[PDB]
Amino acid sequence: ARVALLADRLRVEERLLIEAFAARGHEAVLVQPAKLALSPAAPSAGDFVAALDRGEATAERAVLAALLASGGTPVVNRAATARLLADRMALLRHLILADIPVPETRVCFGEEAIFAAIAEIGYPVVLKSLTVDPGFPVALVEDQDAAEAIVEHRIMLGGERAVLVQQFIPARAGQSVRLVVAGRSLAGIEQRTHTYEAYTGDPAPLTALAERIIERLGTGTYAVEVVETGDGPVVVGVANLVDFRSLSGRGVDVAGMIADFVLG
Amino acid sequence: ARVALLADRLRVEERLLIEAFAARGHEAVLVQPAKLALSPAAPSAGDFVAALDRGEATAERAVLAALLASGGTPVVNRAATARLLADRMALLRHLILADIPVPETRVCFGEEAIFAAIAEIGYPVVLKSLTVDPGFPVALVEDQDAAEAIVEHRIMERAVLVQQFIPARGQSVRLVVAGRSLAGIEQRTYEAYTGDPAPLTALAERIIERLGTGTYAVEVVETGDGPVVVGVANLVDFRSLSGRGVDVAGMIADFVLG
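Output (structure tokens, whole complex):
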């Protein structure tokens, strides 16, 4: 019985998982998705009892999780959750329906709409493609000169016109909170060092937020980016739990929890 | 009582649709998606009884269909049908489950997987992005030279469908679904289909059951073993079919107003 680690190369997190899976009686194996040519009639990546996606959440990895799952190989994160990590639009509507606070957002399907939303929301804002895409990273827009620049760059770089115009809530570095969910429970709370450091504040309110997120969004291996405000916390995004190096450093057995969540 | 025509500009098809809705007591209004900045809480493109998407089916259009429907504006195609027009992967799986013949396909998540699949099925093959993208059109690969050329081109999106390309004389047909039924069959010169419509009419009925009712065109290649479904797209063009006295705009309007 083996376990597939969907990744391109083994890093620190990947070898910690190979220990935790070996400690639990399973041989974790690096499976590079670049070499996967799956057949829709019977998709499979080899003999595996489970697959664990160790890559950045994108649209085709949700496709990969759905194909493998339909073929008999369970995948973490499950396809539907991987879709919420890959699709900012689907995640946004899911958090809204769950009554979880998110920044003011507009869905804009053209250049005019983008400036229409920028006028209504007011500077600053961020432009986010509806689907997580490395070719279009999140774009901060402080003023109209910044707006005319990114809008010109995207018109010039192709035609995936629809973007999200989202209000920017600046954080004093210590309010750049990251809620680490390692399967079934909150593995820890961290804060960015403007590179994740242990949270040095009241952890109960963020724990309550993470517990609602797990209850409504589901269990999995992911990290919720949160920004603390004077009105309360605000969820800005969710991503796959790729970096749990820092949290494992402080004795939190993140890899063990993940290995437990994968085999059950 | 106004209907939104989601399009960048009015062409002959949109003009035929404006008259069809007018003949049915409704004003069809051009609504350019470029100006639409929708609030996710309660999205709205204006006061419209329905929206009819007149553009190419992409993931953004499936999102737009789901958005406007969430706020109380029904959309044709509906979001579930729009998604299958935009998601070649979802369409592939959905047609396979209904035993509807589709070309041999491999889902490849990297460069090494593409050439592995190309070798497994043969030449020629075709390269299709997982979702319909106008910046990555369907790519025909005749030999290992054109294969390695287009692979390098894209890496300047790291997952594609590799699909066996089926040639056709003539024998490449188009099923036109205009609302709730098949409006006609055409063949590639598009002109009127000159074979026997019988097997394609039975296939069209099975397609409609899988994709749902809507406005779309099914690309079919009639081979020796039988008909094979290559793809499905939004019914952007229907000028010639109207010319032959098939009231496509009228059927679409009745489908929208119900």
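The radius of gyration of chain A is 19 Å.
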